[PDB]
């Protein structure tokens, strides 16, 4: 019956940073491995990052590795996704997911629990010089 809620989405200029959080209900949070997934406008959802029960093991999607960092704080029942040097291609609704039994890269369909999603828009001022 674990409930997940993401926060932190917003409109950011390219090169900008953004920090997302995903908080879980109850106090059995350490029993869950978590992941971040994202859905770009009208596309299939893709893997972003994953973190094990103890933050010991982490995985990143190839398009985000090095720019993004996933972390966890058991005292705040939360996982975070720190995004640096954002690109227009990072525009998506970001979702967090939880599972008591599996951790690793990908495995979207494996996760048992899902958040609501938080929107991340990476946009310039749309100024065109011709």
Numbering used by the authors: 1 to 130
Paper text:
The type VI secretion system (T6SS) is a machinery widespread in Gram-negative bacteria and dedicated to the delivery of toxins in bacterial and eukaryotic host cells. The phage tail-related syringe-like tubular structure is composed of an internal tube tipped by a spike-like complex, wrapped by a contractile sheath and tethered to the membrane through contacts with components of a trans-envelope multiprotein complex. This membrane-associated complex is composed of the TssL and TssM inner membrane proteins and of the TssJ outer membrane lipoprotein. By combining interactions with inner membrane and outer membrane-associated components, the TssM protein crosses the cell envelope and is therefore central to the T6SS membrane complex. Nanobodies were raised by immunization of llamas with the purified periplasmic domain of the EAEC TssM protein (TssMp).
